Structure formats: C-alpha cells, structure tokens
Design a protein around this ligand. Structure first.
Ligand code: A1EF8
Ligand code: A1EF8
Lengths: 11, 225, 225, 11
C-alpha cells in the first residue's frame, strides 16, 4: 500500500 | 489587507529545506541528480502536509486527495524553484545551498529542462509575481491538475472555484490598475503544465536508466504518471 | 448581442474541410495516419488564413506571426476536433467524414492521444462551451503560445490582452450567473497544452519511423517544435 | 525558405 496514503492519514 | 484564503495559504507556506549535497561524494551528473531527487523526495513530504491546510482539501476522499497530488506534485515543485529564483538572473535556486547556473545544468544533463524553468521565471519576473499570488497559484495548480481518476468531480470543481475566487478577490483588491491580472496569472498555467510534463518525462528516463538511487515517495509519485 | 472581437472571430471561423480518405486504399494504421496528416496539412493552410483575421495579428512582424503559429498549431487543430465532438459520446469528429471511435483509435495506434482529447471534450461538455467561447479560446491559445522566439514581447502581450479582454467582456455580458466563467475557460488551457505536447510527440515519432507520407507544411510545423 | 512565411505573405 502507498506511502502517499500513509502520509495523507498521518498526524 | 486582503482575502482570508490568501492570508491562510501564506501562513501555511512551508519553511525552506536545504539540499545538503553529500560533501564526501565527488561532483558528477549522478551526484547532482541524486541530490535533486533526494531534495524532491523530502519536499514531497512537506507538500503533502501543506495540501492539508488548503481550505476544503481534507474533506475530499483519500483517493481524490492522492489523485490531485499524483497529478500536480511536479508543478508544485517547479513553482517553488521559480519563486526562489525571481531575484536571480539565469540561475535556479533549487535550495539556498543548491543554485544551478548553465554550467551546472549542462553537467547534470538538465540544460533543456532548466531553460524551460527559466522561461517561467522570466515571465513571473516581468509580471512582478507576489508571494500572495505564488501561494494562490500553487493551490490552483493542485486543484486544477486534470486527473482522470477523480471520484467527486463536483467537490474538486468546488475547491477549484474557492481558490479561483480567492485569486480574483485578491487581484480586485490589490491590483485595481490591471483588471485582467487574475486571468494573466491563470494564463501562466499552460507553460507550468508543459514544463512539469518535460520534468517528469526526464526523471522517468533517469529512473529507467537505473544509475541514480531514488527514495520510495519520489519513485511512487513518478510511477503514478 | 456582445463583444465585437468575438463577433468578428465568429464570422472569421473557417468552413469545415472533409478528410476524404482514399477509397482505393485498404484500411490500415498507415491509411488512418496518412489521412489524419493530410487533413492536418490542409487545415494548417486554413489556420494561417484565419490567424490574419485575428485583430492585430497581421501588425506583428512576419517572424512573430510564424513564431506564434509554430507554437500553437496543434492546440488549434485539437480545439477544432474538440468543438466538433461536443454533441457526440466517446467519438472524435476529425471531420464530418472521419469520426473515430475506440475501435478505430486502437487500429490507428492513437488510443492514448484520443483518450486525452476526449477528456477535453468531456470538460467543455460539462461547461456547455459555446461557439463564441470556442473561437475566443482558439485565438487566446495562439496569442498565449509561449514561443521562446518572440521579437516584440510587448506587441504579443498586447494581442493576449485584447483577446482576454474580449473573453472577459463576453462572459460578463452573457454569463452574469457565473462571474468566474472566463477564468474557468482559461483554466482549460493547461490540459489543451498537455494534449498538444502528446500529439506533437506522437506525430514526430511517426515522421521518424518513416512509413507515413506527410506534406511539406505539416512536416515544417512538426520540425519547428 | 519556409512555406509558412510564403502563406503568411500570400493574398
Ligand atoms: O524538475 N524540477 O523542476 C525539480 C526537480 C527536483 C526538485 C527538487 C526540488 N524542486 C525540484 C524541482
Ligand atoms: O493530433 N490531433 O489532435 C490531430 C491530428 C490530426 C488532425 C487533423 C485535423 N485535426 C487534427 C488533430
């Protein structure tokens, strides 16, 4: 799964 | 004393990051491109954070948030270089510690891409682009990025409308002398799009040629094009 | 009952031309591309004629006239296909006798280019683009074509301003309900630019591959990019 | 010399 998604969900 | 969305995008503008080219590595084409791809990987993290401050962006679906950023990321990187470069002549400020003249552009194999970026610089210099206009155009470029993959077309149109309205209100308030200034700013976006296409094509070619290491986020944004 | 420059561009709009694919030649990729390049060669003659009716274009130097047309010609060809295609679904009207669906696009190797052209069609369909707006945007695309080779930058800026003013006056008069309509039209130009780049790249590749004959004017406009 | 120029000078 995408790091873009991860960073969009993050903090 | 102007439009609140413009005010907000100004205070949302991220702090500069340094390129920090590895001082133990000899100067080469591979070092320059490795330095620029690392800087781009790090700036993409900052860009994802910034996008969340854009009024209404965070209300889109995660899929639509990703779709806009996958389409616009290189345009946003280019606009940052352009803005930093406006007080220079024939040099591109990738970072305060990474300013590329013709000589360095030839050594990196970036002469053609860097000449197109300089054409954008010279246009905005002749219009005396203000930071207020820069941040508004950055947001508009994200909202207007022409992804084929949007789920809520109306919600993205609404974001486009909010930011376009901000640009029109700012120019009406600040630039009474030029009732066409907002449209002149919008008419810079085609060259921005053209330059982004050339930059993504160029870095995609570098990725395939296999000689320049690249970080996960940069490669994922390159794969999405 | 509107802006006089818009009125003039409407009566200046050239008559349709037919593709007339050679009925003695068997259907092939080479026949389709030969037909499209011949049609483009003939439409470029019509476009050069039209450009002379654009108020102020004829007062530029011959060098500047050529520079604007060498930069914008494919955008102008694309906008014609787009306009003719607005009453269709998933088909591109290159000419009344040459309507390309997916099947024909695959057979021509044009599926990707034709999908990008269809994205432009679907945007203008959702905005209900009028002929008045179409001719004005065509002229603006010529004036705003970002040539690196202009001699009289002020004279070209002045042409850009005259046509932008025409678009703003027309929307103010005709589209009171949407005070952002002129800017929304200008915000279609980046996808037009992107699609033109893809089309020119594609036809340049066909020229090098050496299998499709092409006329002098088409090859000269392709060489200028 | 260019056919574009020729056609820009023509009629
Ligand atoms: O191709 N570019 O314009 C480009 C490439 C790399 C970076 C890094 C920061 N800004 C960048 C811009
Ligand atoms: O690539 N195009 O969009 C393209 C190609 C050929 C023609 C001929 C007439 N209009 C054209 C448009």
């Amino acid at each position: 799964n995408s790091l873009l998604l991860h960073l969009l969900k993050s903090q | 004393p102007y439009n609140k969305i413009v005010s907000h995008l100004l205070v949302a503008e991220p702090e500069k990051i340094y390129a920090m080219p590895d001082p133990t590595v000899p100067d080469s084409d591979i070092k320059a491109l490795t330095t620029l791809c690392d800087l781009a990987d790090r700036e993409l993290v900052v860009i994802i954070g910034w996008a969340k401050h854009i009024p209404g962006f965070s209300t889109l679906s995660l899929a639509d948030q990703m779709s806009l950023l996958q389409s616009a990321w290189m345009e946003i990187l280019i606009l940052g270089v352009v803005y930093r470069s406006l007080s220079f002549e024939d040099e591109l400020v990738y970072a305060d510690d990474y300013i590329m003249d013709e000589d360095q552009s030839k050594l990196a194999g970036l002469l053609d891409l860097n000449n197109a970026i300089l054409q954008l610089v010279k246009k905005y210099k002749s219009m005396k682009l203000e930071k207020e206009e820069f941040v508004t155009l950055k947001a508009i470029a994200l909202a207007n990025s022409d992804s084929m993959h949007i789920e809520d077309v109306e919600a993205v149109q609404k974001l486009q409308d909010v930011l376009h309205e901000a640009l029109q209100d700012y120019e009406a308030g600040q630039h009474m002398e030029d009732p066409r200034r907002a449209g002149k700013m919008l008419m810079t976006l085609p060259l921005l799009r053209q330059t982004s296409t050339k930059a993504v094509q160029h870095f995609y070619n570098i990725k395939l040629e296999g000689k320049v290491p690249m970080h996960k986020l940069f490669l994922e944004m390159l794969e999405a094009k």
